[PDB]
Amino acid sequence: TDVNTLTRFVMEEGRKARGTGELTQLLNSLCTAVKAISSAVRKAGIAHLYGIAGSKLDVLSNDLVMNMLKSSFATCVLVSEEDKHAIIVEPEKRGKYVVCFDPLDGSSNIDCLVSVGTIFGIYRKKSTDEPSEKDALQPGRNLVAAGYALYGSATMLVLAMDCGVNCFMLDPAIGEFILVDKDVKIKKKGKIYSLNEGYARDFDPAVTEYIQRKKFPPDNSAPYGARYVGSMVADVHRTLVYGGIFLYPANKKSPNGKLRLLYECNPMAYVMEKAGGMATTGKEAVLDVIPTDIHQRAPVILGSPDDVLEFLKVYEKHS
Amino acid sequence: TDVNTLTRFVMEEGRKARGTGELTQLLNSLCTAVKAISSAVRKAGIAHLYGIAGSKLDVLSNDLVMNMLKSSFATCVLVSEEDKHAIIVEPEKRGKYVVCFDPLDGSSNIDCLVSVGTIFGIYRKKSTDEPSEKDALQPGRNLVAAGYALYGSATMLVLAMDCGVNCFMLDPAIGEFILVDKDVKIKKKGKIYSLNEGYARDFDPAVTEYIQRKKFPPDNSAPYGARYVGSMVADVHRTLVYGGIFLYPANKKSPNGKLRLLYECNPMAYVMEKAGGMATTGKEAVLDVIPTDIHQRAPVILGSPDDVLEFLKVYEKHSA
Amino acid sequence: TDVNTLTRFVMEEGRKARGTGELTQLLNSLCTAVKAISSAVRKAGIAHLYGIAGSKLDVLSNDLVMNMLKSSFATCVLVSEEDKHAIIVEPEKRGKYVVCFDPLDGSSNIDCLVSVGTIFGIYRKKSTDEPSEKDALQPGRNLVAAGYALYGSATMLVLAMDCGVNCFMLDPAIGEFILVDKDVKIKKKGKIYSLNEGYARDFDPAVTEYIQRKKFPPDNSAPYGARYVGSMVADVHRTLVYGGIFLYPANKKSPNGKLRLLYECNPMAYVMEKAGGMATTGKEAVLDVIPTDIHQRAPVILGSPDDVLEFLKVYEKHSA
Amino acid sequence: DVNTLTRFVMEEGRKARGTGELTQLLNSLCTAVKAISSAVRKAGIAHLYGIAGSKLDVLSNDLVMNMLKSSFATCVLVSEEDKHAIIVEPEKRGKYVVCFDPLDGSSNIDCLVSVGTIFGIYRKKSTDEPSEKDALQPGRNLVAAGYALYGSATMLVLAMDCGVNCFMLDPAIGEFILVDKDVKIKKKGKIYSLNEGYARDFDPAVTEYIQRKKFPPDNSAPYGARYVGSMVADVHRTLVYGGIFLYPANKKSPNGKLRLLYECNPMAYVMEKAGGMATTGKEAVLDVIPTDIHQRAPVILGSPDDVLEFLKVYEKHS
Ligand SMILES: CC(C)Cc1cc([N+](=O)[O-])c2[nH]c(C(=O)O)c(CCC(=O)O)c2c1
Ligand SMILES: CC(C)Cc1cc([N+](=O)[O-])c2[nH]c(C(=O)O)c(CCC(=O)O)c2c1
Ligand SMILES: CC(C)Cc1cc([N+](=O)[O-])c2[nH]c(C(=O)O)c(CCC(=O)O)c2c1
Ligand SMILES: CC(C)Cc1cc([N+](=O)[O-])c2[nH]c(C(=O)O)c(CCC(=O)O)c2c1
Ligand SMILES: O=P(O)(O)OC[C@H]1O[C@](O)(COP(=O)(O)O)[C@@H](O)[C@@H]1O
Ligand SMILES: O=P(O)(O)OC[C@H]1O[C@](O)(COP(=O)(O)O)[C@@H](O)[C@@H]1O
Ligand SMILES: O=P(O)(O)OC[C@H]1O[C@](O)(COP(=O)(O)O)[C@@H](O)[C@@H]1O
Ligand SMILES: O=P(O)(O)OC[C@H]1O[C@](O)(COP(=O)(O)O)[C@@H](O)[C@@H]1O
């Protein structure tokens, strides 16, 4: 279409899938919560908290995502970074989908006004009986849809499916997500590497070798640039848009890494794979990992395909 | 505590100075220009480009700050990252202040929606000559006011003057800068180090030693965390808010730093120094460098006092 | 119970009806246009028309509604106030509904910032022929959905369907229409009368008695309060919220009324009747008029049922 | 050039070489009006309806009250909401008295009709300690007056000795842009505005003037009627299109309804500075010495030739 919004896109894909309408509602409701998070994160009401008339952001972000998905009547199992246990959706609001999400990723440094985001992954409930945590304990292969909302210079929702990766820009004037990049694919190889080098002491010998290769090239090529925002959303989105490699690997004081499998690693792994990129743990593909806990951690090396390959060569020489 | 706005703050400080009124109008014009830049960076109206009716961003940032400072009747000389030569203002709109600014810093990566900003530094024409580019070649210690606007997760304008550093959040619901951080001061020592380590090969020997004492500290202490947004305004603002050190040191390519002295290094150094921090080029304080060219490049190492001192002693160990 | 949005409501209503999506996609595309009208009506970006960076409102609304409805793939015949003839939709973007809309009713006095609105009514193409203006010449009982968006104090959409009348409020912080009043009903009787009494010289005796019964109540009761905004969407909505009666009757100048049947009278008559109220020409119900022209005018009297009937007993004394 | 309300008020006080108080006061009021506009337009309404799972005229009063106190520019504040004048705390007092209606018309706000904020500024002329007497000044002593209409769009209209200046809010940046400079009213217009429901209670002179507009004597066009029920909107139409607004003596209101200090006198200043007129029938609104902050007063305002035509009829019945 000429003016393709998230609302039109999500009904067309859907009609194209012969659907009942539940996922379309889930994604329009998730969309609505994304706009409300964006507003508060840009500090909309801040004057009133500072006494203009006289007289928490990740909690509000979680209450928004939760109450919108619940009201969509399309969810049964919800897994959030904020709740230690699975939300079993009250039965008069049960739909057929599992949602795992991080409502505000990077809020560790939200006081320095750094980019943050909302990460989400959506599954079809595997059961046909009673919704359980086990409906959430599915590999990334089974993802119906996954993506993130970036609150940076501007607000962007990225939605990945079998049809591909689609970037929508939020126009704050009218509250519409505007399709602005269709079927995005990654660069085969990039010139950027991304990881917290403040753990350089605790690193794996293969990770140390891959990084020196980027700073000290073996092909007399150009050394890569370094970028690490500290928000996964901003660094993964930079990796999608410009190319390169992002690493939060297993060191030694965290043998499974930091980032969570269900609502951080898997959703980005899906976006990367649909965009022609890769997402390994070192041993297997992040999407191949079988969950055993909802707040499980997994290591992750995602990004441009020839970069994740170059890492894997080193990882296996040291294995 | 009462509520305050950027506008009311700026009007009260000038009422105390019992002066012309040019600097107050200048700051109000920059204020207004930033709120406009913020709206265009947040992509208000992008639906009109994709067919809502049927019927730039770094260049538009320059056009807005240039136009708004000329309408203030407070400027005579203007220097921008975007214009090769200075802009000598029309005589009918001319005033006594020289402004140097980066209209949209970091927007060479804006496609990934990385945090970007507007950096400014205001001087007073100290000369009697006809206005020229030689009026912008004042050192940083002559700065009247400096600061930056950060278009990150939210929009904040950080204003630095002799009275201190003050941080105002942009409330988009009412279009007002709310003061939310009065007379800010930087922590004495931080736990974050900020630099592009992709240049480790061509890094001066002392930088190597300093980053290796943060990665591998022999003092049984916790190693430092690494952060580098790749946009100066976001990296500096994090260094101001959480403490730590930001470094754009000299390397093979860009051997006098890549960052610009008049509108990147000096405004950031003035904010750090007004907040009890420090900012050096290795051999000298950034503010004490006498400029030779308006687009001149300088190295920069800024942030918490103890962290910049720690680098400086490693620097004394690698020099003659 | 739970919060609801227009986008969610219109999608669930279409799912419950096991429909194709055309009405959902039309009503969603008409919503998106309404949010864009509101942003422009509230003068967002007026600063760029006055040189913030150096270098229509009823025509703009029509352009928005037209292109948004055309892009819905749910429309075949489009009748406006701005277009003398109907618009036949290009075949590749053709649907099954016929929309009659007034894209910015009240714009003639938009210089005093009077309340304005977008009135719309949606019919089914009953013809299996080629799309023509003939398809718009359907009576108002054949309406599928009718409503309006008011741009006043706040911006509110009112969407009348067979399920009833529902009022949604635009949250300009998120660009979402929040369901705030459900299955709305009009009061049985009100305390407000609304017409332009400057036409007093020209009223037929039926209007002359009724008015005097409201300023000089025979029932010993209190006199009715007078209100006339001069913008139909504002006067009709007030009559829906507070009850009472709105009148644009047959006078000399404009002898069979001024307000148009297809895109002003019929949509407000459907909202009124679905909310327990009445709308008449004096002779017949507004929804009962078979149209012959798409810009045909009609007398209109609407509002609280006791009030409309009280007039209709007065009209029936001066008939033929 | 691009001229905003903030640029305008700084330049006028720099040319008047003033302390800066008045500039801070109007700039404080400008910030409050932008906050009322956001509330009136229903920002965050989703949060009250449970988007995350979970008073306008009171909020309007609080916003102006606190923005004015914090201005360091006022000493006496009279509000339609506050039954007694507020004496500002000593450690922030200023030299100006402000009478204001924070959200005029908000009675009929369930229908989303245009509402507004009216204000007028005085200089404390007394030598005493601040008190209500500092606000019982007649409207001829006004330094500044005007209104904020929240209609189809938001406009702050500022009237001073320099003239009447109309400014439009760009809600995207939060800036009031000068869109009409040194505004004047038509000598005669073609719109009459009053509640004709109080017809049984009206004075002989009102009934006559009204019937001379609907049933004209000169065989001219009968005048058109417009009555929104909100004064800010009815008086804005009177300033832009011209004509006559009337809230006169009836019976339930022997001295009218609209209050002189924060409704009648403010709009009378705007009209006079725009070449128009504003009378009570007996005297000009600006020349009525008030004894009560919440005192009521009839007001006939609008295009000069039209208000004079009314007065000639009032003098007929005398
Ligand atoms: C790759 C795409 C073609 C998958 C897709 C996308 C959307 N979508 O863009 O919302 C969908 N919506 C719905 C619905 O229930 O209406 C379905 C069918 C349910 C299912 O089997 O998952 C669906 C499928
Ligand atoms: C340098 C700051 C610590 C003090 C400061 C702040 C503002 N202000 O925040 O608007 C000022 N405005 C104006 C003016 O009237 O032009 C002046 C007068 C120039 C001077 O004496 O330095 C002034 C001074
Ligand atoms: C008219 C109301 C009482 C019910 C209603 C409301 C909406 N809606 O709120 O958008 C609808 N949308 C669609 C659609 O086309 O999907 C339908 C089915 C139409 C049909 O069966 O012909 C539909 C029905
Ligand atoms: C009444 C107008 C035609 C002139 C006017 C307008 C503004 N203004 O537009 O804000 C002013 N501001 C200030 C100030 O205090 O700086 C003054 C001077 C103070 C005084 O009245 O003695 C002033 C004068
Ligand atoms: O500070 P670290 O240890 O480098 O971790 C950074 C990582 O943690 C995260 O911040 C996630 O944790 P939070 O969401 O609590 O901030 C990632 O966004 C980011 O990639
Ligand atoms: O890409 P590098 O070499 O790390 O340099 C980053 C620095 O260059 C800049 O991007 C220069 O700004 P521009 O993007 O506008 O050219 C700084 O903002 C930033 O601190
Ligand atoms: O001036 P009048 O005769 O009272 O007409 C008012 C009527 O004209 C209208 O303004 C017509 O709309 P327009 O302003 O777009 O022409 C109605 O909204 C309103 O009911
Ligand atoms: O309702 P009436 O009697 O016609 O009076 C309307 C007048 O009352 C007002 O609404 C003021 O009273 P409120 O502020 O309580 O609404 C004026 O705006 C308006 O001019």
Side-chain angles (χ1 to χ4, degrees):
Chain A
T1 52
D2 197 0
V3 53
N4 204 3
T5 67
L6 185 57
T7 312
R8 285 152 171 231
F9 178 89
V10 75
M11 313 199 264
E12 199 53 42
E13 266 83 8
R15 191 200 67 73
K16 274 187 193 144
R18 305 193 281 300
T20 67
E22 256 196 17
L23 189 65
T24 294
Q25 210 72 272
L26 198 153
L27 277 165
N28 160 243
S29 290
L30 182 60
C31 169
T32 293
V34 164
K35 291 183 287 180
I37 289 161
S38 172
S39 172
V41 165
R42 305 270 186 248
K43 288 310 196 184
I46 196 66
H48 297 270
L49 279 95
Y50 281 84
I52 186 96
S55 284
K56 201 195 314 177
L57 210 64
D58 53 16
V59 169
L60 180 66
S61 290
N62 191 61
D63 302 332
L64 288 158
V65 176
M66 279 269 154
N67 195 76
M68 275 301 115
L69 294 180
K70 193 211 311 289
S71 312
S72 77
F73 280 66
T75 74
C76 57
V77 188
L78 304 180
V79 177
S80 165
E81 181 263 346
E82 285 286 313
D83 309 286
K84 182 189 172 188
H85 307 291
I87 307 270
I88 306 311
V89 175
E90 29 186 298
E92 55 271 42
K93 299 208 224 306
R94 288 189 182 172
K96 40 150 163 303
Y97 294 101
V98 181
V99 190
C100 306
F101 61 86
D102 191 327
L104 213 40
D105 167 86
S107 36
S108 67
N109 297 258
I110 209 160
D111 289 341
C112 70
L113 300 188
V114 80
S115 289
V116 285
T118 296
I119 299 176
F120 62 86
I122 305 146
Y123 292 101
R124 277 161 82 262
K125 145 172 69 55
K126 47 151 217 163
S127 34
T128 289
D129 260 306
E130 159 78 32
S132 38
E133 292 213 338
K134 281 190 245 91
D135 286 286
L137 290 174
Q138 295 188 43
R141 308 191 303 264
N142 301 5
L143 266 188
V144 168
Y148 55 84
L150 181 52
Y151 319 108
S153 72
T155 290
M156 176 158 267
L157 176 138
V158 177
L159 181 56
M161 299 161 138
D162 266 343
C163 52
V165 185
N166 291 283
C167 305
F168 291 83
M169 193 83 76
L170 175 66
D171 180 353
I174 66 166
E176 281 298 327
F177 275 102
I178 296 313
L179 183 45
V180 284
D181 295 306
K182 288 176 35 155
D183 201 31
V184 164
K185 300 306 204 298
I186 205 161
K187 313 194 178 329
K188 206 181 138 193
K189 198 174 176 62
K191 270 70 171 171
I192 300 178
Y193 80 90
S194 195
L195 80 167
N196 190 347
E197 302 201 56
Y199 300 127
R201 177 195 67 190
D202 297 331
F203 273 158
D204 189 274
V207 190
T208 308
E209 178 183 332
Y210 178 76
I211 289 303
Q212 285 189 356
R213 286 179 58 93
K214 301 302 108 180
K215 310 158 138 193
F216 311 93
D219 299 336
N220 73 82
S221 53
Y224 281 18
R227 297 291 206 261
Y228 191 70
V229 179
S231 280
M232 200 203 194
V233 188
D235 282 327
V236 172
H237 189 75
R238 195 205 47 246
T239 314
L240 172 67
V241 165
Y242 282 125
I245 188 166
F246 174 81
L247 305 87
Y248 205 110
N251 47 5
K252 286 172 174 57
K253 195 189 280 190
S254 293
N256 297 277
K258 184 184 195 289
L259 313 184
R260 315 296 186 154
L261 179 67
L262 280 175
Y263 43 87
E264 288 194 342
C265 287
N266 270 311
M268 299 318 222
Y270 191 77
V271 166
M272 278 283 130
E273 266 202 24
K274 284 311 146 175
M278 309 185 44
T280 186
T281 89
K283 303 168 165 148
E284 45 201 355
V286 171
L287 297 186
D288 279 342
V289 167
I290 312 276
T292 61
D293 183 20
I294 66 175
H295 302 301
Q296 203 194 27
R297 312 181 203 261
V300 61
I301 297 97
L302 57 97
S304 293
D306 292 341
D307 281 296
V308 172
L309 292 183
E310 201 182 10
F311 176 84
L312 280 172
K313 289 252 186 201
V314 150
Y315 178 87
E316 313 185 345
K317 191 177 77 87
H318 294 243
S319 64
Chain B
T1 316
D2 268 321
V3 70
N4 212 22
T5 78
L6 171 63
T7 309
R8 192 152 73 173
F9 180 90
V10 175
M11 300 169 145
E12 167 90 327
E13 295 286 353
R15 277 181 65 180
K16 291 174 192 145
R18 292 154 264 157
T20 55
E22 277 180 16
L23 182 62
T24 307
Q25 284 267 23
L26 191 146
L27 285 175
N28 272 92
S29 294
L30 256 179
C31 176
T32 289
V34 164
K35 300 187 296 171
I37 290 160
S38 168
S39 187
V41 163
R42 271 77 163 97
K43 296 288 180 180
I46 205 79
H48 275 59
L49 275 310
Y50 291 77
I52 204 58
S55 177
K56 299 289 171 57
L57 212 58
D58 56 345
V59 184
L60 171 75
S61 284
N62 198 60
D63 294 4
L64 278 157
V65 181
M66 285 266 144
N67 192 250
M68 279 315 281
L69 283 195
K70 290 165 155 168
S71 91
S72 76
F73 284 65
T75 65
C76 55
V77 171
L78 302 174
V79 167
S80 168
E81 205 263 11
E82 156 79 348
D83 304 310
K84 191 207 170 52
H85 308 294
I87 307 303
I88 313 313
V89 164
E90 324 87 20
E92 61 274 354
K93 289 159 190 111
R94 208 177 278 187
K96 34 166 107 184
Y97 287 106
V98 184
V99 192
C100 307
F101 62 90
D102 201 321
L104 208 56
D105 193 77
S107 59
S108 71
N109 291 89
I110 191 60
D111 308 287
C112 76
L113 306 182
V114 56
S115 310
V116 289
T118 308
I119 315 185
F120 63 85
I122 310 128
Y123 300 91
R124 242 177 281 200
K125 198 169 165 296
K126 268 182 37 72
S127 88
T128 62
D129 285 291
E130 275 281 327
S132 75
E133 174 168 347
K134 316 205 277 204
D135 291 300
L137 296 189
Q138 291 191 56
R141 288 224 181 281
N142 293 359
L143 264 173
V144 172
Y148 57 83
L150 170 73
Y151 321 104
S153 68
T155 300
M156 179 182 269
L157 182 140
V158 173
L159 176 55
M161 305 188 283
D162 196 71
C163 54
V165 174
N166 308 289
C167 308
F168 312 78
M169 191 68 42
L170 180 57
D171 180 312
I174 57 169
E176 200 81 43
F177 277 102
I178 302 292
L179 181 42
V180 296
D181 269 89
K182 197 31 163 93
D183 194 10
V184 165
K185 300 279 189 253
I186 201 169
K187 281 157 63 173
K188 211 198 145 213
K189 206 155 168 275
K191 308 192 173 93
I192 305 151
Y193 76 91
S194 196
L195 74 167
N196 193 332
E197 298 199 49
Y199 303 116
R201 201 179 61 178
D202 301 321
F203 268 175
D204 274 47
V207 172
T208 326
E209 218 203 294
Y210 182 61
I211 300 311
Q212 297 212 187
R213 158 186 218 90
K214 288 333 178 163
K215 287 164 149 217
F216 324 78
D219 155 32
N220 84 74
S221 205
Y224 276 34
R227 293 290 195 269
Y228 192 71
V229 173
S231 189
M232 197 209 197
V233 188
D235 287 309
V236 166
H237 186 57
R238 184 197 58 247
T239 298
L240 178 70
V241 167
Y242 291 147
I245 183 141
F246 168 74
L247 312 103
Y248 205 119
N251 83 93
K252 201 185 55 70
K253 276 185 278 210
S254 290
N256 294 322
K258 191 271 172 223
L259 294 193
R260 310 273 197 187
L261 180 72
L262 280 187
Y263 40 85
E264 279 174 325
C265 284
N266 268 352
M268 284 318 190
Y270 188 75
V271 175
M272 284 305 186
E273 280 213 17
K274 282 296 158 160
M278 303 186 56
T280 188
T281 61
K283 190 31 46 194
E284 38 186 347
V286 176
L287 303 185
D288 281 312
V289 172
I290 290 294
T292 61
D293 197 63
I294 54 161
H295 299 282
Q296 185 191 298
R297 290 177 207 272
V300 73
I301 287 94
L302 55 84
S304 289
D306 299 1
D307 280 305
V308 201
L309 287 185
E310 188 158 328
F311 172 78
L312 271 179
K313 276 67 196 154
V314 186
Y315 191 86
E316 300 178 16
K317 282 175 60 186
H318 282 61
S319 55
Chain C
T1 65
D2 313 293
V3 66
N4 207 8
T5 76
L6 181 69
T7 316
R8 192 128 58 80
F9 172 82
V10 153
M11 276 174 204
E12 274 316 310
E13 283 289 307
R15 263 186 87 201
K16 295 182 11 153
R18 200 209 217 299
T20 87
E22 279 195 50
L23 200 54
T24 287
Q25 165 90 63
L26 200 155
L27 278 175
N28 180 68
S29 300
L30 184 55
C31 168
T32 299
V34 159
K35 284 184 299 159
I37 283 163
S38 193
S39 190
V41 158
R42 271 78 159 91
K43 295 298 187 172
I46 193 81
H48 273 88
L49 288 167
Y50 287 83
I52 199 80
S55 183
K56 273 182 277 177
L57 212 59
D58 58 326
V59 168
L60 167 65
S61 299
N62 191 61
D63 283 341
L64 276 158
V65 182
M66 278 288 169
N67 171 224
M68 281 320 280
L69 281 192
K70 278 189 258 205
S71 291
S72 72
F73 284 67
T75 68
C76 52
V77 168
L78 299 174
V79 160
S80 187
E81 175 264 342
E82 302 298 321
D83 293 313
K84 197 216 303 192
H85 286 302
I87 312 288
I88 306 315
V89 181
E90 45 275 54
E92 45 275 15
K93 306 185 190 150
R94 200 168 289 179
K96 80 200 204 178
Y97 290 97
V98 172
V99 191
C100 307
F101 60 96
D102 199 323
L104 200 64
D105 165 88
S107 44
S108 60
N109 310 295
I110 197 96
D111 287 341
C112 71
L113 305 180
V114 50
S115 289
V116 287
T118 298
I119 314 176
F120 64 89
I122 296 146
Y123 302 93
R124 227 281 191 181
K125 184 180 175 65
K126 295 287 289 153
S127 85
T128 48
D129 209 75
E130 288 301 291
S132 35
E133 314 208 336
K134 71 169 294 298
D135 282 291
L137 297 179
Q138 201 162 144
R141 27 158 168 253
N142 295 5
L143 264 164
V144 180
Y148 62 84
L150 181 60
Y151 318 99
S153 166
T155 293
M156 176 192 284
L157 186 92
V158 180
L159 164 62
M161 297 183 295
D162 306 307
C163 53
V165 175
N166 288 296
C167 308
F168 301 73
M169 190 84 89
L170 185 49
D171 190 341
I174 56 177
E176 210 63 23
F177 275 109
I178 308 295
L179 177 59
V180 287
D181 300 296
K182 291 189 279 191
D183 205 347
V184 174
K185 296 300 167 196
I186 205 173
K187 308 199 62 154
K188 209 166 144 55
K189 214 186 171 77
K191 296 166 259 169
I192 289 173
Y193 80 88
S194 188
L195 76 170
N196 190 331
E197 294 186 60
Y199 298 118
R201 208 180 61 184
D202 303 330
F203 287 148
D204 62 345
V207 182
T208 286
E209 293 197 1
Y210 185 80
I211 280 179
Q212 299 292 276
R213 325 195 334 119
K214 292 323 186 135
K215 320 155 123 196
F216 311 96
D219 330 284
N220 117 96
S221 34
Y224 280 31
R227 288 284 192 286
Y228 196 69
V229 171
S231 181
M232 190 193 210
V233 190
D235 286 307
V236 169
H237 184 64
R238 193 205 47 248
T239 297
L240 169 64
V241 180
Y242 289 142
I245 177 141
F246 164 77
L247 312 100
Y248 206 124
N251 56 308
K252 179 178 63 181
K253 156 205 158 73
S254 295
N256 49 321
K258 173 190 192 144
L259 304 183
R260 275 83 149 85
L261 181 63
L262 282 187
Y263 45 87
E264 284 180 349
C265 301
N266 269 332
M268 300 317 205
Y270 189 91
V271 164
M272 274 313 143
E273 271 199 40
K274 290 301 168 152
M278 301 183 172
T280 178
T281 78
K283 290 169 176 282
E284 46 194 349
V286 186
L287 304 174
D288 264 315
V289 181
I290 309 274
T292 71
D293 192 56
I294 58 170
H295 299 315
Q296 195 195 294
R297 307 191 141 145
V300 64
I301 295 98
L302 57 84
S304 295
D306 281 354
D307 287 296
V308 176
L309 286 171
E310 203 180 15
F311 170 83
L312 273 192
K313 239 62 173 293
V314 163
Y315 184 84
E316 287 162 348
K317 323 295 226 212
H318 312 80
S319 291
Chain D
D1 213 271
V2 77
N3 221 27
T4 76
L5 184 64
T6 299
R7 279 215 57 217
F8 179 79
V9 297
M10 264 180 290
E11 178 65 29
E12 287 285 322
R14 292 288 66 70
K15 277 180 322 216
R17 310 168 55 95
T19 56
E21 275 212 4
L22 189 56
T23 291
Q24 281 278 44
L25 190 157
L26 296 177
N27 189 208
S28 296
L29 197 57
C30 174
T31 301
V33 166
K34 286 189 301 168
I36 296 171
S37 180
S38 196
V40 168
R41 300 280 199 262
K42 292 302 209 228
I45 191 61
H47 285 278
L48 267 46
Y49 280 75
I51 190 169
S54 291
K55 201 188 306 170
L56 275 181
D57 56 27
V58 178
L59 178 68
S60 297
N61 198 46
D62 298 353
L63 280 162
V64 178
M65 273 285 149
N66 191 315
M67 275 329 280
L68 285 189
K69 286 164 162 183
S70 54
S71 71
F72 295 163
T74 78
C75 52
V76 188
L77 303 173
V78 166
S79 188
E80 196 278 328
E81 292 295 296
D82 311 321
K83 307 184 56 154
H84 284 301
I86 287 73
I87 311 307
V88 179
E89 315 92 84
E91 308 114 298
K92 60 171 72 173
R93 274 205 269 264
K95 289 62 190 212
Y96 292 98
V97 175
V98 182
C99 307
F100 63 95
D101 201 322
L103 198 63
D104 167 87
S106 87
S107 59
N108 311 135
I109 201 165
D110 303 332
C111 60
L112 307 172
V113 88
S114 301
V115 294
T117 303
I118 316 169
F119 63 92
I121 295 91
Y122 293 97
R123 199 168 298 100
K124 184 173 179 291
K125 280 166 193 66
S126 267
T127 65
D128 299 318
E129 194 88 354
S131 88
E132 285 201 358
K133 305 299 158 280
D134 295 319
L136 294 201
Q137 299 189 47
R140 57 169 101 119
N141 309 342
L142 271 160
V143 169
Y147 56 94
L149 181 59
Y150 318 104
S152 63
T154 303
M155 185 170 287
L156 208 149
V157 173
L158 187 49
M160 288 185 298
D161 210 70
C162 60
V164 172
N165 290 284
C166 300
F167 295 83
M168 185 89 72
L169 185 54
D170 189 332
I173 54 171
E175 215 62 56
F176 274 106
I177 312 295
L178 191 48
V179 286
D180 214 29
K181 205 196 52 147
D182 205 12
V183 188
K184 299 295 157 133
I185 205 183
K186 275 175 108 203
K187 304 269 138 219
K188 174 203 136 301
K190 302 207 173 223
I191 294 152
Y192 80 92
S193 186
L194 89 165
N195 195 333
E196 270 160 281
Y198 302 128
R200 201 180 58 213
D201 322 274
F202 275 153
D203 47 275
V206 160
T207 36
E208 184 169 343
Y209 177 67
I210 292 320
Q211 276 294 132
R212 285 174 44 98
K213 310 268 94 161
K214 323 151 73 153
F215 294 86
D218 198 69
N219 266 67
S220 38
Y223 274 37
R226 292 280 199 272
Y227 193 68
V228 169
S230 203
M231 206 189 171
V232 189
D234 280 324
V235 172
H236 192 55
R237 188 205 38 253
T238 311
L239 182 75
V240 171
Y241 282 106
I244 173 145
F245 171 79
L246 309 109
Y247 206 111
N250 54 87
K251 262 200 258 114
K252 331 156 147 61
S253 291
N255 225 8
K257 188 214 195 123
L258 304 182
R259 321 256 200 172
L260 191 81
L261 260 80
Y262 46 73
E263 265 159 326
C264 292
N265 267 330
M267 290 324 206
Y269 191 78
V270 176
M271 281 285 143
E272 279 211 359
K273 292 310 206 201
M277 277 202 210
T279 185
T280 67
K282 268 142 189 243
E283 44 198 329
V285 174
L286 299 183
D287 282 324
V288 189
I289 310 250
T291 86
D292 200 48
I293 54 172
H294 300 296
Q295 172 173 10
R296 300 181 213 265
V299 75
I300 296 97
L301 57 71
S303 287
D305 295 5
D306 271 313
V307 180
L308 276 177
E309 175 169 330
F310 170 78
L311 283 166
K312 295 191 208 111
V313 181
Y314 181 100
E315 284 184 277
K316 156 171 286 197
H317 301 263
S318 297

